[PDB]
Design a protein around this ligand. Structure first.
Ligand SMILES: CCCCCCCCCCCCCCCCCCCC(=O)O[C@H](COC(=O)CCCCCCCCCCCCCC)COP(=O)(O)OCCN
Ligand SMILES: NC(=O)C1=CN([C@@H]2O[C@H](COP(=O)(O)OP(=O)(O)OC[C@H]3O[C@@H](n4cnc5c(N)ncnc54)[C@H](OP(=O)(O)O)[C@@H]3O)[C@@H](O)[C@H]2O)C=CC1
Ligand code: SF4
Ligand code: SF4
Lengths: 135, 90, 199, 150, 383, 216, 363, 119, 62
């Protein structure tokens, strides 16, 4: 990106970059770390147990959390987790906290409680260039 | 410092009604002057909508979805931005 | 410069924040505290004795002694192109016969519905209009009628100076549009000799 | 040269002497209309050359050393009621910078039905009016049928 | 004590505002709109697709061709029409000229509302130059109707790129002399710094887009994330600030003018030779010489200028990075030659909804600064 | 609050391969499998984000619009933070003639989605003001233009039409020119509304070919 | 002729775009009553021709009143020239005369305006053959045996009009109230803006004022009914009042707590108004001169101006006239009270008003 | 006991409470009284006395509410009340048993070839 | 009063797309109203009307 300030800013220092884009003032003044991401993801893994075992929602949340924790485990520096998960760690901790917050509302609504012969029609679109252009 | 208000003949030297060179504008491709068949390029009327089989007892495996994701900074692959929209050769 | 100061902050929450906490010293867009005597004198010569007002004043005084961009209408005019969409007009062949053949394509394409056409066959068998109205107060001056015409009968000419005192003077019938074409024919033909290379 | 200035002033105003110029009603309106005053006294007497004259009497000047879009100007012959609707269409595209053609360098094709340019008639009672108007010689009732008269 | 709010009516003369104050501090702002609601969404159902195109010039009438772009792209997607390369380059070039015009007007009208009168008069002569560029290719200074389904309406006249290069050679000097009056001035800073702050969470929660979104530290440009025409080939930067200030939005808008100049220079050097219209004759009308010499061209000219093409049944939403944010069209097709439903999404409608939460804690003399920095035009707000 | 400026270099890429593949291919099946009771119908079509892809459309009941939108905002794989608009489409041939349409944008993964609810004239739709703050003015406009009542709204009042305007103009049975028109009366010294009279009535041109195949 | 005027060419339901079939010439169309008559005719789809003598700025308000082509404006009217009168009526089947005068001038006398011009107008109207109706306006107090000159010249001109055009209708309304009238406006300018207001004698002479919209409706009702041709109608409101009662009503309505009027003998009032009546000629006419500062007004104040017994009035036209003392007619004089019109405290009735309304009005 | 929760009479009571402030603000003190205004607003309510659906009742009450605040906030003036509320009522109760023995058909016949549209 | 009907094929052409033959594919049933008064504009001759339902059934309701 281009910085509109006429002064020279380093931006290799990651704390300066987090200050300049307003992460400190507007999202989280406390710096997010790898341990806080691990704690938040384990909070999600504890919170999802209110969903039934056979539900696809629980499997989806658990698989996402397990992949995130494996990324956290195999990478020690927080810049590596930033480069893998394509965000700032403050964003990722907020994502995990929001995912943990979501669980009681979904569990109260119970979307998994459909009949056994539940049916959803789907209509898909095929482009003309599939049959007109070269295979 | 470049000056606003250029002087005589330094800007719009010729009026658009007195263009100094005659213009030859292409209005057709040379590939279509003598090859005029239309049904081989009827993209408008050849798109399809198909009703899928009823999405009930399918098998969403999350293991395969999360098994294709990277875990290290290198081995992350990114989709490059498309340079142009499709022109179909024209 | 784009630098910030504690005190030049336009609001109150940030004014209260800068005078009770040193969080502004972490932000890289702020100007730092002067460290020695000469820096204090530079900061005071910035705040007192202005010198930021004076740069704008020097620029506007340079503009006072510079050149001007005003044209003396109506002794001097602006600049337009042969594609310019002005007052509508009806055209003839060089013989003197009307080009229009009452196809009603310009009436069909008109998004404003500003055209009203009636026709019958002339006494020599020709297909010609008996009514051709253009409501100039309904027209949007798009030029779509000029594009739809297959015989170049209706055009938008190069005239833009046609303001009137009554609105009834802006409901053009067929005779006035032919009179406009008879007035502007040579200019319209000169414009169309260039614009036919592109259209 | 002030002799050049006065010769330019006399050829632009169309008068015969400075005494005839300063004692005219045209100079009286140039004391109260500053747009005409600037055009006659400053622009027409400056650097530039005369290009041509139309049939309404207006003179056309140009200066290639000027800024773009201020190279061409007109001196209207009607000093008291000057109007741009008296410019003929063969000078209109030159003065509006649409093309570089005028009668002094281009022979236009003249149609046999061409109506010459004259001043607008708006605000007077000889303006254009539609055929259903009160000001027409015979107003039209636009009925599309014929009534039975016994 | 039990202080009731003092209310105020702010202008019939087309924004109407009903404020509440607790002294000199505003507690509430309620905009009343619809004074320019002309019902263009209903009128588009009674037009063919070519007939309804000049309605879009009159939505954001500071930025015309960008409004045309999204409607054209929405039609082209359902029609499955490809645009040739030269037409894509022309569309990108005139979209960036349009963005320069809009940002000139927005910054100088804002600075005139604050009190600085000279930058308005300095920038409008540059606006006149870009209006001459519009007129030389379309014959209209503002409502061009230039972008069409499958390309552009006419080719570029010979001699246009020469003059666009001559304008772009001095535009940076004009932007430089513009900033000498405003950027390092204490009165402008004291009017604009920390006024109407927008954070990222509030920006996404309130549907913001455009230079508001970039001044709150969000890297989101539709010309780089979801590119359209030849914008993926263009090399330019996204300006980023991090306070969410009026001052930061002003700086972001100036830098966006610089980047638009960069894209304009790149388009002037890579302009290709070739077709500017799609060669599908059942969508695009033929040339006027072809129409007067072949029977199929005359039939297609007759039918395309009366009934128009039939768009296949379906729906789409297509958006463009308009100079005020994201401008989008939701087109619903039943199969006819007329749109069944055409919803118009305007960014200024969402930006004006925020005035209740942005003007809280501000004074009466900062309302006009907030309205000016949101960059609102009521044609697109009131459809 | 996402898509913070992180890379200081120029990026020549959009998204990652795995997440773009998931969003462009698997998102319909994912949403159907995780929350099946919320979804009644799905369409995967020509992609709001770009001409090159496909994107889903989700049909839901009004009883579960709010939980589905909360799930689509807060779930870790579907982070649809921005609500771009709310509108309606009138289908007078149906038993429930209105389709309320919600467009969403995900800044985290460069995605878009569309959500539809079918109701008639007298069935309320739950408001999304608590989920998205822009839902206020869009629901006010939808009530103004179509007469769709949004229950639980803080202040559902008309926003676009005239002050005394009864009637919903974007319905198919509402006339284009309306019923009333406006003029100044010298006798009453007031601007007065009167029944409609037109000097030239609107000419409707019926262009549609009896050979055309695409009309649906 | 009978009722073919209102039925034979009537096209459309009767709005601005419809056609009534009436082409009318209104003389004095820019005046107080003429503007309301021109509005009444043009709003129903009639073509109205309006000649005028004044500048175009004072006639521009008539341009709005009708659709495109239906208001015709003819400036530089000279009523001593028959060519202007002939051109203005050359297509009209209805002529309405609202030309009148209140003070004499060195260029125009009462006979020139009330006698000579109505006679020549009636003659030129009868010459055309297509004029089916001539509506001439006179005063309720018009009398050939009146000491006031304007009443006498008005009655003489009424006789000349009924002589030359035998089916012309003569209309004689009372005092006309309105926003731009010459009755309450000069009385309010007499109660305020002067050190004292003279009242002629005891102020016990009776008048019958009427509303301007009722007179405008009366013209259209006359044009409907064929029996009213050749007749004379007196237009007066539903209440008979004395001048003292009118002054008391104005002083109560204006909320003035000091009666500045003084009752004076008629010779004293005439002695006051005599110096500015012997100099009324050799002068082109001065602004802000009251029409009540003449001896003719003093002679009018010594007589009753009411509807005569057995005369044709509003009831024969089917019109119930509106009250003049209260309602919409008295609202303009309520705007000139001390301080302003205003609502009040507005708090007794705002008790059970909803939430946002009280805060909106800051109650 | 009262159909659909008695919401019609509750809304009527709310409008009747709101009415004297309307009369003061719109300066209708010498034009209509509160008794005849209450009777007129009551006559607006009886036109939908045969609605069999509670959702239609709720929508009608919501729309009538929005009408009453657009009258409260001076967005329609006194001439709007005259031309829309009280003169239609006085026309519907003034033409009853007219002084002429013409049927409604014959008045319609003499007026125009077609029925009148609107008011 | 309204009329519910499906319009017949035009005599000038042979195609059947706007008929009740393709009723399940395309909406073909219409709602139409009786005409009300029309007259000519005195100034221009344009056709005037006071009918609000003059084109709403024939353009929009299928
Ligand atoms: C011809 C017309 C001439 C004027 C043209 C320019 C108009 C400018 C108007 C705005 C001026 C702003 C201004 O006065 O700002 C103040 C500083 O300047 C001043 O106070 C300036 C006035 C005083 C001049 C300097 C006085 C001290 C000089 C040295 C004295 C000691 C040595 C000699 C004995 C305070 O602004 P701030 O930011 O400082 O406010 C501190 C808290 N925010
Ligand atoms: N209460 C009342 O006012 C009553 C009025 N009338 C009659 O009704 C008519 C309308 O009166 P009102 O409108 O109140 O009075 P106004 O003065 O307002 O109207 C008189 C009109 O006649 C025109 N006029 C006067 N003298 C001449 C002239 N010499 N040549 C050409 N035009 C002339 C005036 O035009 P300009 O503007 O150029 O002067 C003006 O438009 C009057 O004629 C009056 O006699 C009768 C009874 C009561
Ligand atoms: S230019 Fe446009 S508005 Fe004017 S007549 Fe032609 S199509 Fe109609
Ligand atoms: S002007 Fe041209 S398009 Fe219009 S009716 Fe005549 S020939 Fe046809």
């Amino acid at each position: 990106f281009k910085a509109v300030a006429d002064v020279e800013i380093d931006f290799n220092n990651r704390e300066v970059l987090k200050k300049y884009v307003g992460i400190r003032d507007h999202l989280s003044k406390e710096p997010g770390t790898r341990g806080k991401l691990i704690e938040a993801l384990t909070e999600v893994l504890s919170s999802i147990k209110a969903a039934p075992e056979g539900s696809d929602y629980r499997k989806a949340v658990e698989a996402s959390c397990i992949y995130r924790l494996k990324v956290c485990k195999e990478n020690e520096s927080d810049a590596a987790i930033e480069e893998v998960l394509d965000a700032h760690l403050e964003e990722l901790i907020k994502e995990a906290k929001e995912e943990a917050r979501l669980v009681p509302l979904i569990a109260g609504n119970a979307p998994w409680d459909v009949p056994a012969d539940y049916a959803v029609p789907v209509v898909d679109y095929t482009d003309a260039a599939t049959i007109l252009d070269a295979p | 410092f470049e000056h606003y208000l250029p002087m005589g003949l330094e800007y719009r030297k010729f009026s658009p009604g007195t263009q100094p060179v005659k213009a030859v504008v292409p209005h057709d491709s040379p590939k279509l002057v003598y090859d005029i068949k239309y049904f081989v390029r009827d993209y408008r009327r050849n798109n399809k909508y198909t009703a899928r089989t009823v999405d009930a007892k399918t098998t969403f495996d999350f293991d395969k979805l999360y098994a294709g994701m990277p875990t290290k900074p290198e081995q992350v692959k990114n989709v490059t931005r498309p340079l142009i929209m499709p022109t179909r050769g024209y | 410069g784009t630098e910030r100061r504690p005190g030049e902050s336009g609001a109150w929450k940030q004014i209260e924040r800068q005078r009770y906490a040193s969080d502004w010293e972490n932000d890289p867009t702020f100007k730092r505290t002067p460290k020695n005597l000469a820096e204090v004198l530079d900061d005071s010569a910035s705040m007192l004795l202005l010198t930021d007002v004076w740069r704008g004043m020097a620029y506007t005084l340079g503009a006072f002694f510079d050149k001007k961009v005003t044209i003396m209408y109506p002794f001097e005019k602006g600049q337009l192109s042969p594609r310019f969409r002005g007052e509508h007009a009806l055209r003839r062949y060089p013989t003197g016969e009307e080009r229009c053949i009452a196809c009603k394509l310009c009436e069909a394409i008109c998004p404003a519905q500003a055209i009203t056409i009636e026709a019958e066959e002339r006494e020599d068998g020709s297909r010609r209009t008996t009514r051709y109205d253009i409501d100039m107060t309904k027209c949007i001056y798009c030029g779509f009628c000029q594009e739809a015409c297959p015989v170049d009968a209706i055009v938008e000419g190069p005239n833009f100076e046609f303001s009137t005192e009554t609105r009834e003077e802006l409901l053009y019938d067929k005779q006035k549009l032919l009179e406009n074409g008879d007035k502007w024919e040579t200019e319209i033909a000169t414009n169309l000799r260039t614009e036919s290379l592109y259209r | 040269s002030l002799s050049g200035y006065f010769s330019r002033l006399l050829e632009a105003s169309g008068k015969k002497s400075v005494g005839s110029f300063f004692a005219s009603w045209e100079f009286g309106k140039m004391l109260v209309d500053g747009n005409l005053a600037h055009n006659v006294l400053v622009r027409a007497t400056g650097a530039g050359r005369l290009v041509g004259t139309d049939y309404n009497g207006n003179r056309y000047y140009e200066n290639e050393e000027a800024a773009y879009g201020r190279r061409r100007w007109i001196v209207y012959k009607d000093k008291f009621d000057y109007n741009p609707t008296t410019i003929p269409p063969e000078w209109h595209g030159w003065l509006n910078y649409i093309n570089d053609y005028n009668p002094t360098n281009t022979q236009f094709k003249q149609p046999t039905y061409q109506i010459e340019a004259s001043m607008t008639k708006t605000g007077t009672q000889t303006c254009y009016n539609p055929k259903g108007s009160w000001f027409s010689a015979k107003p039209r009732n636009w009925r599309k049928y014929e009534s039975w008269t016994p | 004590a039990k202080v009731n709010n003092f209310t105020l009516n702010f202008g019939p003369q087309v924004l109407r505002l009903v404020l509440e104050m607790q002294g000199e501090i505003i507690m509430r702002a309620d905009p009343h709109i619809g004074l320019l609601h002309r019902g263009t969404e209903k009128l588009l159902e009674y037009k063919t697709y070519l007939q309804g195109l000049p309605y879009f010039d009159r939505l954001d009438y500071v930025s015309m061709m960008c409004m045309e772009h999204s409607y054209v792209l929405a039609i082209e997607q359902l029609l499955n029409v490809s645009v040739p390369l030269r037409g894509q380059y022309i569309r990108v070039l005139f979209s960036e000229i349009t963005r320069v015009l809009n940002h000139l007007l927005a910054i100088t009208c804002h600075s005139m509302d604050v009190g600085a009168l000279t930058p308005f008069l300095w920038a409008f002569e540059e606006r006149e130059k870009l209006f001459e560029f519009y007129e030389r290719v379309s014959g209209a200074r503002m409502h061009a109707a230039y972008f069409r389904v499958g390309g552009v309406s006419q080719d570029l006249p010979i001699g246009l790129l020469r003059d666009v290069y001559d304008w772009a050679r001095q535009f940076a000097s004009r932007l430089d002399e513009m900033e000498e009056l405003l950027t390092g001035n204490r009165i402008w800073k004291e009017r604009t710094v920390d006024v109407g702050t927008i954070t990222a969470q509030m920006a996404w929660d309130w549907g913001c887009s455009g230079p508001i979104l970039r001044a709150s530290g969000i890297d989101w440009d539709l010309r780089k994330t979801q590119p359209y025409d030849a914008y993926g080939k263009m090399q330019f930067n996204v300006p980023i600030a991090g306070h969410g200030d009026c001052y930061d939005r002003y700086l972001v808008r100036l830098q966006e003018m610089r980047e638009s100049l960069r894209i304009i220079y790149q388009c002037l050097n890579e302009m290709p030779d070739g077709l500017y219209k799609s060669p599908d004759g059942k969508v695009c009308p033929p040339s006027r010489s072809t129409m007067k010499q072949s029977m199929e061209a005359l039939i297609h000219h007759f039918k395309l200028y009366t009934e128009g093409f039939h768009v296949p049944a379906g729906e789409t939403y297509r958006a463009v990075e308009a100079p005020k944010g994201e401008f989008g069209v939701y087109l619903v097709s039943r199969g006819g030659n007329r749109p069944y439903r055409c919803k118009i999404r305007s960014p200024g409608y969402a930006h004006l909804q925020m005035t209740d939460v942005i003007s809280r804690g501000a004074m009466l003399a900062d309302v006009v600064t907030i309205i000016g920095t949101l960059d609102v035009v009521f044609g697109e707000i009131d459809r | 609050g996402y898509a913070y400026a992180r890379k200081t270099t120029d990026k020549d890429y959009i998204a990652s391969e795995h997440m773009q593949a998931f969003g462009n291919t698997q998102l319909t099946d994912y949403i159907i499998k995780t929350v099946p009771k919320f979804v009644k119908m799905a369409v995967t079509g020509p992609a709001q984000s770009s001409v090159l892809y496909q994107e889903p459309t989700i049909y839901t009941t009004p009883e579960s619009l709010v939980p589905l939108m909360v799930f689509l905002r807060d779930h870790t794989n579907t982070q649809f933070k921005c609500l771009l608009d709310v509108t309606a489409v009138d289908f007078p041939e149906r038993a429930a003639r209105f389709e309320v349409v919600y467009h969403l944008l995900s800044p985290r993964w460069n995605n878009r989605i569309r959500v539809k609810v079918c109701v008639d004239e007298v069935t309320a739709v739950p408001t999304l003001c608590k989920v998205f703050n822009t839902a206020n003015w869009f629901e006010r406009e939808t009530w103004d233009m179509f007469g769709v009542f949004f229950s639980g709204h803080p202040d559902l009042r008309r926003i676009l039409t005239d002050y005394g305007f009864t009637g919903h103009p974007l319905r198919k049975d509402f006339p284009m020119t309306g019923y009333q028109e406006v003029r100044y009366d010298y006798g009453k010294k007031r601007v007065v509304s009167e029944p409609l009279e037109l000097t030239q009535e609107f000419r409707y041109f019926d262009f549609n070919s009896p050979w055309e195949t695409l009309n649906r | 002729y009978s009722s073919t005027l209102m039925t034979a060419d009537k096209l459309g339901p009767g709005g601005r775009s419809s056609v009534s079939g009436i082409t009318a010439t209104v003389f004095g169309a820019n005046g107080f009553l003429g503007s309301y008559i021109v509005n009444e005719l043009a709003k129903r789809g009639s073509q109205v021709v309006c000649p005028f003598r004044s500048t175009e700025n004072e006639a521009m308000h008539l341009k709005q009143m009708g659709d495109l082509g239906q208001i015709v404006l003819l400036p530089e009217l000279d009523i001593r020239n028959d060519d202007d009168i002939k051109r203005a009526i050359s297509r009209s089947n209805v002529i309405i005369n609202c030309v009148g005068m209140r003070l004499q001038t060195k260029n125009w006398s009462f006979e020139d305006v009330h006698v000579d011009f109505p006679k020549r107008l009636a003659k030129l109207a009868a010459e055309t053959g297509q004029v089916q109706r001539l509506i001439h306006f006179s005063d309720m107090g018009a009398d050939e045996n009146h000491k006031s000159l304007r009443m006498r010249t008005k009655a003489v001109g009424d006789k000349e009009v009924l002589d030359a055009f035998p089916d012309a209708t003569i209309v004689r309304p009372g005092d006309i109230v309105g926003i731009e009238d010459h009755f309450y406006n000069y009385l309010i300018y007499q109660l305020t803006l002067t050190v004292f207001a003279p009242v002629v004698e005891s102020g016990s002479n009776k008048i019958q004022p009427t509303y301007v919209l009722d007179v405008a409706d009366a013209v259209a009702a006359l044009l409907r009914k064929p029996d009213t041709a050749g007749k004379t109608l007196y237009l007066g409101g539903p209440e008979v009042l004395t001048m003292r009662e009118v002054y008391d009503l104005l002083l109560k309505t204006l909320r003035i707590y000091r009666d500045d009027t003084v009752h004076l003998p008629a010779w004293a009032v005439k002695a006051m108004y005599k110096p500015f009546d012997s100099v009324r000629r050799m002068l082109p006419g001065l602004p802000m001169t009251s029409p009540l500062a003449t001896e003719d007004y003093v002679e009018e104040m010594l007589r009753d101006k009411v509807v005569p017994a057995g005369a044709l009035g509003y009831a024969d036209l089917g019109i119930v006239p509106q009250k003049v003392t209260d309602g919409l007619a008295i609202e303009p004089v309520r705007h000139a009270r001390v301080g302003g019109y205003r609502w009040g405290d507005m708090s007794a009735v705002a008790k059970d008003i909803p939430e946002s309304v009280r805060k909106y009005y800051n109650i | 006991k009262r159909l659909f929760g008695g919401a019609a009479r509750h809304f009527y009571f709310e409008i009747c409470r709101c009415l004297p402030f309307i009369q003061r603000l719109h300066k209708m003190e010498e034009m209509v009284s509160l008794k005849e205004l209450r009777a007129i607003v009551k006559e607006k309510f009886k036109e939908y006395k045969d609605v069999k659906d509670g959702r239609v009742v709720d929508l009608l009450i919501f729309k009538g509410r929005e009408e009453i605040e657009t009258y409260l906030l001076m967005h329609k003036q006194r001439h709007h009340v005259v031309t829309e509320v009280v003169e239609p009522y006085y026309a519907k109760q003034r033409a009853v048993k007219k002084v002429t023995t013409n049927s409604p058909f014959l008045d319609s016949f003499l007026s125009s070839g077609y029925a009148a549209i609107g008011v | 009063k309204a009329r519910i009907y499906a319009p017949a094929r035009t005599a000038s052409q042979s195609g059947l797309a706007r008929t009740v033959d393709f009723a399940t594919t395309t909406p073909a049933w219409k709602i139409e109203f009786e005409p009300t008064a029309k007259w000519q504009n005195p100034l221009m001759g344009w056709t005037s009307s006071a009918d609000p339902l003059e084109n709403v059934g024939r353009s929009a309701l299928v």
